[PDB]
Amino acid sequence: DFIKNGQDVSKIEITLKNSPNVTDIEYIDARDETIKITRIITRSKRRSDY
Numbered sequence: 001d002f003i004k005n006g007q008d009v010s011k012i013e014i015t016l017k018n019s020p021n022v023t024d025i026e027y028i029d030a031r032d033e034t035i036k037i038t039r040i041i042t043r044s045k046r047r048s049d050y
Helices: none
Strands: 009-016 034-040
Touching: none
Parallel strands: none
Antiparallel strands: 009 034
């Protein structure tokens, strides 16, 4: 119900800024200041793809 009717795929690009003060980042090294995440979700699957 969140996705508007008429389409099945939804491209949403979300970015996060990581600072060296916070460590122990999972799947991402602490030296990377910014990250690029392009998530997409459809009506068939319940979980979202990242």
